[PDB]
């Protein structure tokens, strides 16, 4: 079965060209299927950009056709997107898709997606802060801890937890933007018998700034 | 149209059935094949119906589709908690010569009302070095989504400097969670003793109150 993976930059400047590629493995690109691109702006719906087939035939979204080129290289096993004169409104998650065309026009499978921000703002790594209970807090059979992630740009970060218990009782809260910087947080719940008697650490990855930050949650 | 018309939301309990509609101008869907996509928050869309009414291998028979020419429908029967998702229809629009998606429909799965588990956290010493101070309150695993959070500093209500963020519906237990963060300067923070987060939810007329005292 078909395997798709998008690659490209997470941050592009206004008026520059966005270039993405998609590696297609485990399926012949010379079969009768189109290869295309879909995008989704944060909190909004799906938008078709266009598609291409090995014969050279291409279809584009009418509003973007002047700025968009979608092409393929079947030896390299790649489908490409090139969107010129980018604006802030081009920020989105971009997905590569295989398309059965003709009268069907179904999309299966989809790549995992790549987040792309169009902005003039500078890349900024996260500051990460431990959230431990206040002194004298009354402990039930479980205890919640957290990490607060502030002051980064652009999206995204990933927050993971390491604990003695290997609890997956984790909540990751969506990031909010304020004066050009995002803030988010994450909570983990573990049995009170396992913290602070065993370690709980959060790890925060921000690929855009090539930064990873760990914080150990220690009692106050 | 350049986007097909769908209702914003539908909601039902496990075991029940929902129908989601997808409409265009007059009978524009008559000679087009409609497909449907399930998008669980945090993941890519997944094909669930194609050619109006066919299911890919692996998709259960409780997903079904129809296309009357004016309107296409996705039926989801025997609802399960993992069906929570945004659902999108799609089809070629021959009048525009472009592939068109629907506006999307969020499916909420119902459950019994549940009160939040509330936890409060003072600012870390490390943050205070920045000159800022965030006091954080987590309100976890509650239903329904509607909730009110009040912050008090030394028993007095604080309205400015509060940011709230909600999770998407949980795929295993159908609950929601929320973070509330009060941001003050370090100097403000250090002028007061008691910090309180109060959560009012339909599960009780009494707020759930969590506090800490700096001394």
């Amino acid at each position: 079965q078909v395997q798709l993976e998008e690659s490209g930059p997470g941050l592009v400047r206004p008026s520059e060209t966005l270039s993405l590629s998609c590696t297609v493995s485990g399926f012949p690109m010379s079969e009768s299927y189109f290869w295309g691109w879909i995008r989704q702006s944060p909190g909004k719906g799906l938008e078709w950009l266009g598609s291409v087939i090995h014969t050279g035939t291409t279809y584009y979204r009418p509003s973007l056709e002047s700025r968009l080129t979608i092409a393929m290289d079947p030896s390299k096993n790649q489908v490409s997107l090139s969107l010129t004169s980018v604006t802030v409104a081009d920020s989105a998650m971009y997905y590569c898709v295989r398309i059965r065309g003709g009268s069907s026009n179904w999309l299966d499978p989809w790549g995992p997606g790549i987040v792309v921000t169009a902005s003039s703002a500078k890349t900024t790594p996260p500051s990460v802060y431990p959230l431990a209970p206040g002194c004298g807090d009354t402990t039930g059979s479980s205890v919640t801890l957290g990490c607060l992630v502030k002051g980064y740009f652009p999206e995204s970060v990933t927050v993971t937890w390491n604990s003695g218990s290997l609890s997956s009782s984790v909540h990751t809260f969506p990031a909010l933007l304020q004066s050009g910087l995002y803030t988010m947080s994450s909570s983990v719940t573990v049995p009170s018998s396992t913290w602070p008697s065993q370690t709980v650490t959060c790890s925060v990855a921000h690929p855009a700034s090539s930064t990873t930050v760990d914080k150990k949650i220690e009692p106050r | 149209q350049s986007v097909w018309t769908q209702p914003p939301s539908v909601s039902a309990a496990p075991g029940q059935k929902v129908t989601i509609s997808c409409s265009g101008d007059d009978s524009i869907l008559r000679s087009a094949f409609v497909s449907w996509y399930q998008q669980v928050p945090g993941s890519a869309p997944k094909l669930v119906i194609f050619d109006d009414r066919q299911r890919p291998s692996g998709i259960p028979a409780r997903f079904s589709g129809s296309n009357s020419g004016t309107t296409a429908t996705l039926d989801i029967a025997g609802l399960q908690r993992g069906d929570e998702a945004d659902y999108y229809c799609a089809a070629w629009n021959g009048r525009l010569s472009a592939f068109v998606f629907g506006s999307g429909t969020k499916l909420e799965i119902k459950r019994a009302d549940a009160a939040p588990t509330v936890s409060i956290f003072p600012p870390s010493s490390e943050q205070l070095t920045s000159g800022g101070a965030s006091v954080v309150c987590f309100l976890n695993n509650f239903y329904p989504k509607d909730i009110n959070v009040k912050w008090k500093i030394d028993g007095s209500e604080r309205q400015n400097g509060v940011l709230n963020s909600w999770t998407d519906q949980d795929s295993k237990d159908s609950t929601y969670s929320m973070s509330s963060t009060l941001t003050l300067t370090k100097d403000e923070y250090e002028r007061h003793n008691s910090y309180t987060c109060e959560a009012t939810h339909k599960t009780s007329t009494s707020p759930i109150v969590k506090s800490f005292n700096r001394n």
Partner: peptide, 17 residues
């Protein structure tokens, strides 16, 4: 009775059987 046009293009209308 709705079927495909009898796949190297996109947007072809379906036909009746």
């Amino acid at each position: 009775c709705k079927i495909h046009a009898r796949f190297d293009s996109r947007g072809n209308p379906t036909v009746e059987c």
